[PDB]
Amino acid sequence: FGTNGFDIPTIAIALLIVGVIIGLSGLILSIFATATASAISNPSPGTLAYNLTHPLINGMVSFFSFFPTLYVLLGVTGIVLIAAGIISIIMEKF
Amino acid sequence: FGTNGFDIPTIAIALLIVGVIIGLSGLILSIFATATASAISNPSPGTLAYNLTHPLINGMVSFFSFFPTLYVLLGVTGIVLIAAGIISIIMEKF
Amino acid sequence: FGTNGFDIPTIAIALLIVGVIIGLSGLILSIFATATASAISNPSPGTLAYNLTHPLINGMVSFFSFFPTLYVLLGVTGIVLIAAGIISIIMEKF
Amino acid sequence: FGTNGFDIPTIAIALLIVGVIIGLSGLILSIFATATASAISNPSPGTLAYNLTHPLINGMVSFFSFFPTLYVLLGVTGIVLIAAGIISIIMEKF
Amino acid sequence: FGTNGFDIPTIAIALLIVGVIIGLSGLILSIFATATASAISNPSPGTLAYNLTHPLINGMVSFFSFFPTLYVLLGVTGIVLIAAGIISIIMEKF
Amino acid sequence: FGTNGFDIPTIAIALLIVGVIIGLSGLILSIFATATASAISNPSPGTLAYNLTHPLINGMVSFFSFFPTLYVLLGVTGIVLIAAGIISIIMEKF
Amino acid sequence: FGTNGFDIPTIAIALLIVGVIIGLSGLILSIFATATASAISNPSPGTLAYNLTHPLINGMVSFFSFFPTLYVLLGVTGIVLIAAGIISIIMEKF
């Protein structure tokens, strides 16, 4: 059901796969982050360990705040792909 | 029952296949998302784990909100295909 | 009973085949959709699982609402085919 | 049924083809425009996204408002063609 | 249905193609611009980041304000093409 | 749909591409500039580091203030291109 | 009584076999689950053994709640098989 490489069943299967992969990734990351939060403690506001550890958790927070826009762009990509498929069908179907 | 590659039984079978695939995909995604919702907890509004986990669920929500328009375009594609078939029949049947 | 490829018995057989295929497809889709409806539950209006699952059922609804016009065009195609056959007969029968 | 290239059956078939093509085009455009209208939202009257998006929908509206006169001229062309055919018949039929 | 290269079905197909392409482009641009608006924040009116970022969004706004007249001229082009076709038909049809 | 190299679908695709590229560029620049603003600190008004660092941020500000007119001219270029296309069509279509 | 591999007696025998197997499986599972329920006790709501044992019975409950949809799909499969057989008969019986 297509013309050259655009196959609606294949597209549906790809959507299935990407959705399940993203769900698994989110699950694993949340489960691991809970363990991270449990492991690290709060020594004191101004002692040696605070200076030793604070920037690391800052970097953690920053990177995890960068994740959302990555996911948004990844989602955007599929609309472009489907649109290109539709245009390719229309071009030489007539 | 066609002229070159347009076969009404084949079209009906293709519609059958795509419908069943989409149904299965929705079923699997809902079943898995229920497990995801059960697994992840809500630690606190402002502790370390919240900073660690919130953007991930934000990305989840965004991608899953992107799904609907993907499905809509996928549905639109079939009308174009059937229309191209009709035009191709009319062109050289007379 | 024809001139080149237009055979009334063949046309009747083709109509038989397409009708039975469409009936089977509708039967299977309804039976499977009942199972889909039974499987998925309604967690809550505003919790995590709702955000996780709602757009999927929205896409389900949209695609299944797209089906009717597909069926209508598929039905329209046969009138065109029979008309082309009649014209082809008339052209060189005299 | 003609003299050189003017064939009344051919003209009727051409009218059939153009009518069906225009109908299909209008159908597809309306169906797709409904999806476009559903997809785009209204963020706010004066925020960043409004400045980012408004001229695009303005261009959409303008082009789609240009369509009608295109269709009108396309319709006008057929009268000219049929008239030229009639004149050509009259010129050397006598 | 034409004389040399002017084909009414071809013109209708071209109109179909351009309309669908413009719709897709507007859709993609709006969807992406929403993500852009979400990503960039408003640091402060007078700090370093404001000086660093403001002219960029100014250029964004300017270019997107330039789009409308581009679309208008693109729409105008088709009337010229159809008119040239009509004149070419009239010139040597008689 | 053109005469030699002027193709309305190609023009629309080019507009799509340039718009998306400009959006991506603005996004990346804003995201990076936020990091720049976060990284550099304000030592003091008159110490060694101030003399060492101030002209650099001055140059940053100047260049980023130069960007807007660059974008404006880049936008202007497209109107010229489309106009040249229209004139070229008109010249030898008649 | 068939054409290639579709044999109505064979289908009836297969239905017999699957029905009896499913009945036996349900019987054995219920009989064993009764023994499981008898064996495990309820120590206390909050002591060590409760923490040690509760998630296991939770997993038991979850998996056994997953069984029903598995059975439903297994039942659905037979309608598809019989339908494919009917279509295959019709295709080349005429």
What 3 state SS string does chain C have? CCCCCCCHHHHHHHHHHHHHHHHHHHHHHHHHHHHHHHHCCCCCCCCHHHHHHHHHHHHHHHHHHHHHHHHHHHHHHHHHHHHHHHHHHHHHHC
d(CA E55, CA A44): 43
d(CA G23, CA G34): 17
Residue type, D23: G
Is residue C88 a contact partner of residue C3, using CB atoms and an 8 Å limit?
A: yes
Whether residue B90 and residue D38 make contact (CB cut-off 8 A), yes or no, is no
Using a CB-CB cut-off of 8 Å, the residues of chain B touching C70 are 15, 78-79, 82
Whether residue E93 and residue D77 make contact (CB cut-off 8 A), yes or no, is no
F65 CB neighbour count, 10 Å cutoff: 13
Q: Which two tokens mark C12?
A: 């009747």
DSSP-derived letter for residue B87 is: H
Whether residue G69 and residue C35 make contact (CB cut-off 8 A), yes or no, is yes
Is residue A88 a contact partner of residue A4, using CB atoms and an 8 Å limit?
A: yes
With 0-12 CB in 10 A as exposed, 13-18 as middle and 19+ as buried, what is E81? buried
Instruction: Give the N- to C-terminal CA distance of chain D in Å, as an integer.
Output: 16
Q: Given the structure tokens 């019709």, which residue do they identify?
A: G90
Cα torsion through F49, F51, F55, F58, rounded to 10: 70
Using a CB-CB cut-off of 8 Å, the residues of chain E touching F85 are 77
**Left (φ > 0), alpha (ψ -120 to 50) or beta: where does F86 sit?**
alpha
Residue type, D26: G
Whether residue D69 and residue E61 make contact (CB cut-off 8 A), yes or no, is no
C-alpha distance from E74 to closest chain F C-alpha (Å): 7
Using a CB-CB cut-off of 8 Å, the residues of chain D touching B86 are 20, 24
Residue type, B29: L
d(CA B72, CA B82): 17
d(CA A36, CA C23): 56
Residues listed for chain C: 94
Q: Given the structure tokens 């296949």, which residue do they identify?
A: B17
Whether residue C84 and residue B93 make contact (CB cut-off 8 A), yes or no, is yes
Taking Cα atoms as reference points, which of E54, D38, G14, B79 lies closest to residue F34? E54
Give the number of beta-carbon pairs within 8 Å between A and E: 27
Nearest residue of chain G to residue C38 (CA atoms) = G69
d(CA B72, CA D39): 10
D32 near B CB under 8 A: yes
Using a CB-CB cut-off of 8 Å, the residues of chain B touching D13 are 94
Q: Which two tokens mark B89?
A: 């029949």
Q: Computed from CA positions of residues E8, E12, E13, E15, in that sequence, does the dihedral angle turn out positive or negative?
A: positive
Residues 6+ apart with CB under 8 A from A31: B39, B40
**Cβ density class G22-57: b for 16+ within 10 Å, e for less:** eeeeeeeeeeeeeeeeeeeeeeeeeeeeeeeeeeee
In the three-class reduction of DSSP (H, G, I as helix; E, B as strand; rest coil), residue F74 is classed as helix
Q: How far is CA B38 from CA B34, C47, E76, F81, G62, in A?
A: 6, 11, 57, 57, 12
d(CA E75, CA F31): 36
Q: Given the structure tokens 């035009």, which residue do they identify?
A: B87
d(CA C60, CA C69): 16
Q: Which two tokens mark G20?
A: 């009896």
Residue type, A51: N
Q: Which two tokens mark D20?
A: 């069906």
G61-70 own/partner pairs: CB under 8 Å, 24+ apart: G64/G33, G69/C35, G69/C38, G69/C39
D43 near E CB under 8 A: yes
Angle, CA D63 vertex, CA D60 and CA D66 arms, to 5°? 150
d(CA D34, CA D38): 6
d(CA D33, CA G54): 55
d(CA E74, CA F79): 10
d(CA F20, CA F9): 17
Nearest residue of chain D to residue E17 (CA atoms) = D25
What is the resolution of the experimental data for this entry, in Å? Answer: 4.3
Whether residue C80 and residue B93 make contact (CB cut-off 8 A), yes or no, is yes
D63 CB neighbour count, 10 Å cutoff: 21
The experimental technique behind this entry is cryo-EM
Residues 6+ apart with CB under 8 A from B11: B82, B85, C74
B70 near D CB under 8 A: no
D1 near E CB under 8 A: no
C-alpha distance from C2 to closest chain B C-alpha (Å): 15
Nearest residue of chain A to residue E34 (CA atoms) = A72
DSSP-derived letter for residue F45 is: S
In the three-class reduction of DSSP (H, G, I as helix; E, B as strand; rest coil), residue B94 is classed as coil
d(CA D27, CA D19): 12
Q: Given the structure tokens 């492991």, which residue do they identify?
A: A39
Q: Which two tokens mark A74?
A: 């990844």
A34 near B CB under 8 A: yes
Residue type, E71: Y
Whether residue G76 and residue C13 make contact (CB cut-off 8 A), yes or no, is no
Taking Cα atoms as reference points, which of E37, E75, E33, G80 lies closest to residue D62? E75
d(CA D80, CA D77): 5
Is residue D1 a contact partner of residue D9, using CB atoms and an 8 Å limit?
A: yes
Q: After which residues does chain E break, using C–N > 2.5 Å?
A: none
d(CA E11, CA E83): 12
Q: How far is CA F53 from CA E44, F45, F64, in A?
A: 22, 11, 17
Whether residue G76 and residue C21 make contact (CB cut-off 8 A), yes or no, is no
d(CA D92, CA D47): 71
Taking Cα atoms as reference points, which of F22, F69, D57 lies closest to residue E60? F22
In the three-class reduction of DSSP (H, G, I as helix; E, B as strand; rest coil), residue A41 is classed as coil
Residues 6+ apart with CB under 8 A from C35: B27, G69, G72, G73, G76
In the three-class reduction of DSSP (H, G, I as helix; E, B as strand; rest coil), residue D40 is classed as coil
Using a CB-CB cut-off of 8 Å, the residues of chain C touching G78 are none
Whether residue F67 and residue E80 make contact (CB cut-off 8 A), yes or no, is no
In the three-class reduction of DSSP (H, G, I as helix; E, B as strand; rest coil), residue F57 is classed as helix
